[PDB]
């Protein structure tokens, strides 16, 4: 199980475009023991890691889908199992990672054998952290089309779906005074995030 040797080498060569000394946000969707969306974001350089994973616990996923990320589980079948472990293995040693609520990132990293990675815990309230939520989506929505379901928050209220990548961007904007100017560039090749499939032709 996991990535093949040549895949790991391509991933390692890929991870070199990460600046190991720059500020790096990280966030996930899904529980740290069963994540389905992973994102790292370096605002100063614009480099970001973004990929997806099929969940193990389908029951807990449906709750996360209805209260948080709104991802269709069928859109994750094409992801490669083991990408999350391989990427976490490939993060630079003694890296400093920033997050809004460091508890979940810590469990994920520690359970993957990366206790060397230090975490900066930014503690913004749940409305303070999403101040730039609309502005972030308005500029970067083309970077993730995976949040297709209706997300909701006694009484129900429909909300904007949570995206691990958009969270990293809007959290950094909240502590920096606005959106960054650095164009965003993906660290991971697209062929590594999803297995390409030709859609069925309508005859
Ligand atoms: Zn997303």
Swiss-Prot record:
Cellular compartment(s): Virion; Host cytoplasm
SS bond list: none
Positions contributing to Mn(2+) binding: 27, 29, 167
Site (Important for exonuclease activity): 104
Subunit structure: Homomultimerizes to form the nucleocapsid. Binds to viral genomic RNA. Interacts with glycoprotein G2. Interacts with protein Z; this interaction probably directs the encapsidated genome to budding sites. Interacts with protein L; this interaction does not interfere with Z-L interaction. Interacts with host IKBKE (via Protein kinase domain); the interaction inhibits IKBKE kinase activity.
Free-text comment about domains: The N-terminal region is important for the cap-binding activity while the C-terminal region contains the 3'-5' exoribonuclease activity. A CCHE zinc binding site is present in the C-terminal region and may thus contribute to the substrate binding and/or the specificity of the exonuclease activity.
Family stated for the protein in its record: Belongs to the arenaviridae nucleocapsid protein family.
Functional summary from the UniProt entry: Encapsidates the genome, protecting it from nucleases. The encapsidated genomic RNA is termed the nucleocapsid (NC). Serves as template for viral transcription and replication. The increased presence of protein N in host cell does not seem to trigger the switch from transcription to replication as observed in other negative strain RNA viruses.
Protein name: Nucleoprotein
Stretch of the intact protein here: 363 to 569 of 569
């Amino acid at each position: 199980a996991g990535l093949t040797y040549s895949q790991l080498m391509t991933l390692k060569d890929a991870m070199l475009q990460l600046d190991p000394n720059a500020k790096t946000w990280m966030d996930i969707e899904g529980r740290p023991e069963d994540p389905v969306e992973i994102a790292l974001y370096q605002p100063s350089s614009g480099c970001y890691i973004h990929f997806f994973r099929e969940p193990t616990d389908l029951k807990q996923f449906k709750q996360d889908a209805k209260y948080s990320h709104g991802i269709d589980v069928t859109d994750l079948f094409a992801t490669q199992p083991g990408l999350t472990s391989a990427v976490i293995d490939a993060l630079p040693r003694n890296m400093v990672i920033t997050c809004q609520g460091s508890d979940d990132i810590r469990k994920l990293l520690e359970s993957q054998g990366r206790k060397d990675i230090k975490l900066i815990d930014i503690a913004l309230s749940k409305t303070d952290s999403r101040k730039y939520e609309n502005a972030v989506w308005d500029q970067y929505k083309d970077l993730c089309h995976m949040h297709t379901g209706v997300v909701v928050e006694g009484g129900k209220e429909e909300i904007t779906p949570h995206c691990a990548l958009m969270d990293c961007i809007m959290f950094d904007a909240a502590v920096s005074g606005g959106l960054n100017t650095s164009v965003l560039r993906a660290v991971l090749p697209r062929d590594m995030v999803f297995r390409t499939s030709t859609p069925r032709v309508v005859l």
